[PDB]
Amino acid sequence: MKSVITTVVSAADAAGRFPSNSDLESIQGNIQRSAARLEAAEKLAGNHEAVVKEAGDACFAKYAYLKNPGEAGENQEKINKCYRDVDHYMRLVNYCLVVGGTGPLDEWGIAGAREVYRTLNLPTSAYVASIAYTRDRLCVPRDMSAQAGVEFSAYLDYLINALS
Amino acid sequence: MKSVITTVVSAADAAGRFPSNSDLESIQGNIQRSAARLEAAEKLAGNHEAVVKEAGDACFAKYAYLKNPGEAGENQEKINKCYRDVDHYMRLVNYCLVVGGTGPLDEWGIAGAREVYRTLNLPTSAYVASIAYTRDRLCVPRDMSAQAGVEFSAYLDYLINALS
Amino acid sequence: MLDAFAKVVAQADARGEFLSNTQIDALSKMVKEGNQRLDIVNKVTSNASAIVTNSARALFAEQPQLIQPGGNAYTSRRMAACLRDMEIVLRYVSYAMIAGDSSVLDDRCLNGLRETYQALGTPGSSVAVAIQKMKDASVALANDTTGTPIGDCSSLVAELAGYFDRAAVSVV
Amino acid sequence: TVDKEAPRPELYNKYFSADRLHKAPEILFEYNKTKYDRVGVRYTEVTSKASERFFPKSRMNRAPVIEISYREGAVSTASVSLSMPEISGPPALPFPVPKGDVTTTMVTDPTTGRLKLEFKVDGAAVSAYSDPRA
Amino acid sequence: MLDAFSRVVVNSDAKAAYVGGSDLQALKSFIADGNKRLDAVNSIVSNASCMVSDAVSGMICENPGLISPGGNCYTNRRMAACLRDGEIILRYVSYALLAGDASVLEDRCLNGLKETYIALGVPTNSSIRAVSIMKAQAVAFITNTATERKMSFAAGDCTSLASEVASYFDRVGAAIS
Amino acid sequence: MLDAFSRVVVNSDAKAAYVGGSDLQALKSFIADGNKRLDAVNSIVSNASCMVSDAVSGMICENPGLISPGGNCYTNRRMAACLRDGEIILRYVSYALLAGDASVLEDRCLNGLKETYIALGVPTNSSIRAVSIMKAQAVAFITNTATERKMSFAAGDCTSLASEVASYFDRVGAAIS
Amino acid sequence: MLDAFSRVVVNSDAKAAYVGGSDLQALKSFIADGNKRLDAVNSIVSNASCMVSDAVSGMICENPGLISPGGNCYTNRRMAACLRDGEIILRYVSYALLAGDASVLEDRCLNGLKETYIALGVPTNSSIRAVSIMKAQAVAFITNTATERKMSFAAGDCTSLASEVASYFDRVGAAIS
Amino acid sequence: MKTPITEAIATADNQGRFLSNTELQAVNGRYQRATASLTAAKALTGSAQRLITGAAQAVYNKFPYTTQMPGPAYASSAIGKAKCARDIGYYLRMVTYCLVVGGTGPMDEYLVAGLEEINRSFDLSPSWYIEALQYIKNSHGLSGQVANEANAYIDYAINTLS
Ligand SMILES: C=CC1=C(C)[C@@H](Cc2[nH]c(/C=C3N=C(/C=C4\NC(=O)[C@H](C)[C@H]4CC)C(C)=C\3CCC(=O)O)c(CCC(=O)O)c2C)NC1=O
Ligand SMILES: C=CC1=C(C)[C@@H](Cc2[nH]c(/C=C3N=C(/C=C4\NC(=O)[C@H](C)[C@H]4CC)C(C)=C\3CCC(=O)O)c(CCC(=O)O)c2C)NC1=O
Ligand SMILES: C=CC1=C(C)[C@@H](Cc2[nH]c(/C=C3N=C(/C=C4\NC(=O)[C@H](C)[C@H]4CC)C(C)=C\3CCC(=O)O)c(CCC(=O)O)c2C)NC1=O
Ligand SMILES: C=CC1=C(C)[C@@H](Cc2[nH]c(/C=C3N=C(/C=C4\NC(=O)[C@H](C)[C@H]4CC)C(C)=C\3CCC(=O)O)c(CCC(=O)O)c2C)NC1=O
Ligand SMILES: C=CC1=C(C)[C@@H](Cc2[nH]c(/C=C3N=C(/C=C4\NC(=O)[C@H](C)[C@H]4CC)C(C)=C\3CCC(=O)O)c(CCC(=O)O)c2C)NC1=O
Ligand SMILES: C=CC1=C(C)[C@@H](Cc2[nH]c(/C=C3N=C(/C=C4\NC(=O)[C@H](C)[C@H]4CC)C(C)=C\3CCC(=O)O)c(CCC(=O)O)c2C)NC1=O
Ligand SMILES: C=CC1=C(C)[C@@H](Cc2[nH]c(/C=C3N=C(/C=C4\NC(=O)[C@H](C)[C@H]4CC)C(C)=C\3CCC(=O)O)c(CCC(=O)O)c2C)NC1=O
Ligand SMILES: C=CC1=C(C)[C@@H](Cc2[nH]c(/C=C3N=C(/C=C4\NC(=O)[C@H](C)[C@H]4CC)C(C)=C\3CCC(=O)O)c(CCC(=O)O)c2C)NC1=O
Ligand SMILES: C=CC1=C(C)[C@@H](Cc2[nH]c(/C=C3N=C(/C=C4\NC(=O)[C@H](C)[C@H]4CC)C(C)=C\3CCC(=O)O)c(CCC(=O)O)c2C)NC1=O
Ligand SMILES: C=CC1=C(C)[C@@H](Cc2[nH]c(/C=C3N=C(/C=C4\NC(=O)[C@H](C)[C@H]4CC)C(C)=C\3CCC(=O)O)c(CCC(=O)O)c2C)NC1=O
Ligand SMILES: C=CC1=C(C)[C@@H](Cc2[nH]c(/C=C3N=C(/C=C4\NC(=O)[C@H](C)[C@H]4CC)C(C)=C\3CCC(=O)O)c(CCC(=O)O)c2C)NC1=O
Ligand SMILES: C=CC1=C(C)[C@@H](Cc2[nH]c(/C=C3N=C(/C=C4\NC(=O)[C@H](C)[C@H]4CC)C(C)=C\3CCC(=O)O)c(CCC(=O)O)c2C)NC1=O
Ligand SMILES: C=CC1=C(C)[C@@H](Cc2[nH]c(/C=C3N=C(/C=C4\NC(=O)[C@H](C)[C@H]4CC)C(C)=C\3CCC(=O)O)c(CCC(=O)O)c2C)NC1=O
Ligand SMILES: CCC1=C(C)/C(=C/C2=NC(=C\c3[nH]c(/C=C4\NC(=O)[C@H](C)[C@H]4CC)c(C)c3CCC(=O)O)/C(CCC(=O)O)=C2C)NC1=O
């Protein structure tokens, strides 16, 4: 992981420094955001039954080739276990939205994914359109507010720009 | 130089990563800090020609033995070195108030300091006997603002832990 | 050398195509300001020895360690070569004022200027503070309302600052 | 460029001179609510064309263009814009041209490009005459 | 500089000249309601091309024998001359709005205007009909009461300068009466 | 916020304007089938430059007398003026598609164009042939039934908007007949 | 590495002064415009996979002699490296704009990449055609005038900021030159 | 590439001089032939499509052998004509580029520099090439001083091959 609170005390530990004023300054800007940042995850949790009911099958709605004989989304032990794995990705950003950092993505999911999914007979392009439909569905005042939505978008695209 | 910006990108160069969403609320931590920070810096420049005297005579109001023969403050061209050397310490304070870190202190004034004070027979605690008089002289709404006095006194805590 | 008209020639010669019509009405905006370019270069080079010697004099006042013996600009050989380079930047900035781009200033004068100074040992932070005197002595010279009629030339004085700060960040 | 057609018998010269003919003060305005707002007048020759009963010189060739940015399912960043500039047409029609004669063209945004056409096929410097003699 | 406004005109020569920002307030203190009056010209000259086209076509579509073969708005050199003729009387009434008097409009435009039109055969009953549409436009643009284009202005009344231009258009119609 | 659109088209000058995300929802709600209509104007103006280049060259391909010496597609300024007359009507019919009416089409573009063309020597039946290709080219782009190009769209029909431009292109051909 | 806040300190150091109110006036206006720059660089790094897509697949269609057998991007390691060599140099200018100073770009990469590249054999004119293809790719994103993806910002004018990332990328290309 | 601005600069630099009132007047005349040269190369792109192969047919109807000769260096078959929508379009491109800068800049280094080596060792004799743009100089559709400024750099390109 790396949040804002550990990344100052890790470079203070590699030189053995005391917590300086710049270390005292780096914590303050989380408080200006986490009034609006910690209330985006609670809308993300109560709607979590219906967003992957909308976007998790949208990448099956663009792709009927995922259900062929010898595929990943073909039958009920692997269709419903697709919804096993995709609601972890809703859960992973719910753990990134509360820490203020990019921590639990590459703690748990982003870490070495190109040698996971090059074995499992999985394209990475199926993983694209599930969150690519999720991100452009954001209109501003209903799921978000103005200053809340400036960084929930930044957690939508951070997994997009990592694995691709 | 140690600042509030040098921790952000030298970690991100060691991470091999972009500036994420995590890296920029030290910069929101910067601008909430930097409004009432720099009011302390220009207020020091409107007084400092007396302040390095009025804290500078206090170490001669504490340790009168320096004016003896054979000592460091024995004559007038050596006493104006002692006001040269104390103005250059308080010239690095307002540099340290601009950058928001401690880097100008820890390269030009602290790094290599205590190896030359021994060899030139200068007392390592008469300097911190002087800027201790800089620390109690604050009455916080009058000289500073109500929050800016603590963020100025926190750099007086750094340099008396550098010589002691 | 290249001026602003020579930009979009070479910005379309490797592209291959002809000059498109949506670019050149911005370039025929530039000839409306062609008469407010040539007064302004005439404002700089008429006072071209009063911006140099008034800012070298205010450089050695604040920094007495350059004219002290053993300093960099001590002798009469190295004083004349300090006033030489203070006027050289005043030429190549005003060359970039009349042309419309930076690309004669940072190709004939700033391409290795700080690495000239690291080899010779001159303080490269201190040539920037002489240039920023000459920035303030010329931007405030090119806002007089004598000699020209009045009117808003606020767009063209930011270009004169923008090459004076380009020599302020070239030499450090 | 000399359409002497005003029949024009010389019976207008005692009331309107030749130098002071079809010349009127045109007033200019740099009115942008700014400190450099100038008013000016200038006194030039007045010309007109016969088309301007219905298409005057301010409304001459000004048609409302539409630019639409739209990715698929991206209505939160999709936008419409509207302007009417002095709109010029596309580049000109070519020669009649015979059994082909490498039909020309031009396309794209940055620059005009332009290729070479052999009626559909676009040869354009591949050097088909490649015959060394060993 | 009101004389140097006139010295664009009276030396019969094509130049360009302006008035700067410090030179504006000398004219604005001198000319009463100059913030209204510079708005009054700028309401006209921003639509000076459209003012002549509704004026000449309302003269055409009410008097349809003018575009006949034999009519005086045939033979497209003669049509373009009539569109030029409505422009010069629009700029001279706009400069009369700026200068505040019609005394530069009377000698430069209206003097000799009467018998120079029967010199060429202009139907002057159509010409009084042509300038009356421009009288209806200029009271719509200055009062911001045009039926299709409203413009942004400072809030207030402009009924004196509406009547002054409508006085100044009547000197054009009485010159060809 | 169509008043904000109509004030762009009434000011008779060059002025850029654009719509943010809130007012686009006011655009999509005020105009019916706005998900369909804004697709239909985008399918034309993405390929509007090839539509004017094909159709008047198809007018050359059926009427070859226009590029004769003495024809009206000779003297390449006049050839480009036919291309300039090609591009204005496509921007005007797309705004007539977008507003849902032809009331902006009649006054700004179709008023007096027949009298303009017979005074300029323009062969108006040749332009009827050029604009009938435009009625076929706009329908094949709205229905996405073009032979050489196929753009991605949402599923469904657009035959109301495919028939609406045939109402709009016949208004141009009735205006110049 | 230099900061712009550090830039006024060494300005005030060989001068041996304190910090006055005079040079302080640049930096206090830099604070309130800090959020506008903070609204810029988040969209530079989040569309970076597209900017390294069009870095190398765009430069190879305008010189395809490197995918030829014998070229300098022929094998699938040099195909892999050219995808990798461009995604570090826009990572460095994302660091460089937050400090504001180009010296962090100079000491880390722009001191000596030119001397490697003629011993690594790659051509520099191919590189600056691939440098400048990210230049206009960058300046669309800061202004929100990009075509296929339009992102969330506020409303204003960052053309002082949009020249600054164009003030970096020419010196990216001039370093290889 | 020698812009008339850039030799006011380069003949103020080899003497080591500030930009005096001598070279300030030469860039004023570049601002005086600005508008009368910028309508030329704008509208020459507006009528460019006729001028490429309408000038090519003014060579084959002058020279019938160029379609009839057996050789690689002619427009006889269908591959030589595709070079002939390219190799005389370069002459039409740089005459637009000279009217941007107001001087004879881009064709002095891109076109004319080292040209007899290209001509003699391909046998591409310029008796076609002079008549390739001789159709352009009289059928451009331009009048006034816009004609004479557009015809100013055409016959500089004539005399460099003649
Ligand atoms: C956790 C984050 C989160 C979101 C982003 C939304 C996404 C979302 N929107 C809707 C459902 C809806 N969403 C919108 C609003 C919008 N739809 C769009 O396509 C526009 C871009 C946007 C603003 C105009 C509307 C109008 C509906 C009802 C009609 C519909 O189904 O689209 C639904 C179905 C259930 C519901 O009503 O909530 C979902 C999951 N909901 C969430 O829980
Ligand atoms: C860049 C930042 C910077 C500094 C922090 C100072 C630090 C400093 N002080 C002194 C040097 C000195 N400093 C003192 C100062 C003191 N002795 C006393 O009796 C008091 C305790 C105290 C003053 C209150 C004296 C007396 C000398 C002279 C040493 C000598 O006589 O040999 C020197 C040696 C060179 C010299 O003599 O000037 C240096 C480097 N100078 C700098 O340039
Ligand atoms: C830049 C920072 C800065 C400061 C820290 C003070 C430091 C300082 N104090 C005084 C002068 C004074 N300063 C104080 C202030 C105080 N005395 C106390 O006992 C309290 C601790 C404190 C707040 C009540 C008082 C009461 C005087 C008058 C004389 C004295 O007692 O020193 C003076 C002389 C000129 C003046 O009055 O301004 C200076 C420079 N001033 C500054 O400009
Ligand atoms: C050979 C040398 C040479 C020059 C330097 C220029 C000088 C010059 N400037 C102006 C004319 C002018 N010049 C200015 C310029 C300025 N006003 C300011 O407040 C700024 C300080 C300054 C810009 C640097 C303005 C505002 C005008 C009047 C507006 C206008 O040009 O239309 C005129 C009158 C003709 C005209 O209006 O264009 C001339 C000859 N021309 C030359 O031939
Ligand atoms: C100094 C001020 C000044 C003017 C006011 C006009 C006045 C004016 N108008 C025309 C000339 C003309 N004026 C008109 C105008 C009209 N005829 C009509 O039927 C309509 C009523 C009306 C237009 C709406 C026409 C049609 C001609 C040309 C007549 C012809 O050439 O046969 C001439 C030509 C004779 C000559 O050139 O000497 C002059 C001086 N021109 C000026 O220089
Ligand atoms: C706002 C309203 C508006 C329009 C509808 C267009 C229409 C338009 N076209 C031309 C002008 C022209 N229009 C054409 C067009 C054509 N001739 C043909 O033989 C083809 C059939 C057709 C092209 C396909 C030509 C050739 C000219 C040139 C005549 C000239 O330049 O004098 C003119 C100028 C006529 C004049 O000066 O009076 C106008 C107003 N432009 C506008 O501003
Ligand atoms: C076919 C027959 C035919 C007509 C009967 C006239 C139509 C016409 N329009 C106006 C009247 C007007 N005409 C305009 C002019 C314009 N309005 C704008 O929004 C544009 C900016 C500008 C060019 C169109 C204005 C501002 C008025 C006054 C407002 C009004 O009453 O309509 C008048 C004078 C008022 C009156 O009715 O007495 C007439 C007669 N034009 C014709 O062609
Ligand atoms: C440089 C060019 C230049 C101009 C174009 C004018 C423009 C102008 N007019 C007014 C100000 C005004 N303008 C008008 C005019 C009008 N209001 C109406 O309701 C009518 C539509 C219209 C009549 C024509 C009025 C009534 C005022 C307020 C009174 C006044 O200041 O004159 C103001 C001051 C506005 C303010 O700050 O509140 C300005 C800048 N002045 C200039 O210096
Ligand atoms: C901001 C700009 C903007 C646009 C460009 C449109 C674009 C647009 N149209 C539709 C949605 C649609 N779009 C079309 C249109 C078409 N389908 C076809 O097969 C025809 C080729 C074409 C007509 C020309 C239809 C028929 C629908 C579904 C019904 C509807 O929503 O109107 C959708 C939603 C797609 C979905 O449900 O996933 C979008 C984004 N709307 C906008 O807000
Ligand atoms: C030499 C003589 C010559 C012609 C007679 C015409 C040939 C021509 N093409 C189209 C018809 C068309 N032309 C286009 C235009 C285009 N298609 C695209 O994919 C591009 C985007 C764009 C420029 C090429 C379209 C979309 C159609 C309708 C679909 C089709 O028939 O192709 C039509 C109208 C349909 C009809 O009534 O037949 C005609 C007459 N072009 C010529 O050159
Ligand atoms: C040679 C083969 C070839 C390609 C590989 C593509 C690639 C490509 N894209 C652009 C041009 C561009 N490319 C982008 C990049 C993107 N747009 C977005 O919004 C996405 C988030 C992002 C990833 C795709 C942008 C923003 C522009 C500028 C155009 C614009 O959108 O305004 C350019 C022009 C830049 C230049 O050369 O100067 C090229 C060559 N086009 C081609 O002709
Ligand atoms: C600061 C950023 C930064 C870099 C750029 C690289 C610098 C760099 N690039 C390459 C190496 C390379 N870089 C490229 C890329 C390119 N060559 C071209 O012809 C194109 C112009 C361009 C793509 C846009 C290629 C093709 C190689 C060759 C790999 C090889 O030789 O095996 C190597 C050799 C790697 C090795 O030997 O292991 C190094 C050190 N490192 C860094 O830290
Ligand atoms: C948590 C992550 C995080 C961010 C994403 C930024 C978010 C951010 N952006 C702006 C605010 C802004 N950002 C822009 C920038 C732009 N507008 C444009 O028209 C251009 C497209 C673009 C770049 C030129 C402008 C013009 C403002 C308003 C001015 C301002 O108050 O800063 C503001 C200040 C006002 C507000 O509270 O909204 C903030 C906090 N800061 C953060 O802490
Ligand atoms: C073509 C344009 C051009 C540039 C860009 C240039 C840079 C340049 N500056 C030089 C020297 C110098 N430059 C300086 C100037 C300074 N040092 C300081 O400490 C001051 C801060 C500053 C003066 C204000 C000095 C003192 C020398 C050394 C002269 C010598 O050693 O002889 C030298 C060594 C040769 C010499 O002039 O003696 C070069 C090449 N020379 C050029 O001809």
From Swiss-Prot, chains E, F, G:
Q: Which residues carry this modification: N4-methylasparagine?
A: N72
Q: What is its main location?
A: plastid
What topology does it adopt in the membrane? Peripheral membrane protein
Which positions in this protein are listed as binding (2R,3E)-phycoerythrobilin 1?
A: C82
Which GO CC terms are listed, alphabetically? chloroplast thylakoid membrane; phycobilisome
Which residues hold phycourobilin? Answer: C50, C61
Task: Name it.
Answer: B-phycoerythrin beta chain
Species this chain originates from:
Porphyridium purpureum
Gene giving rise to this polypeptide: cpeB
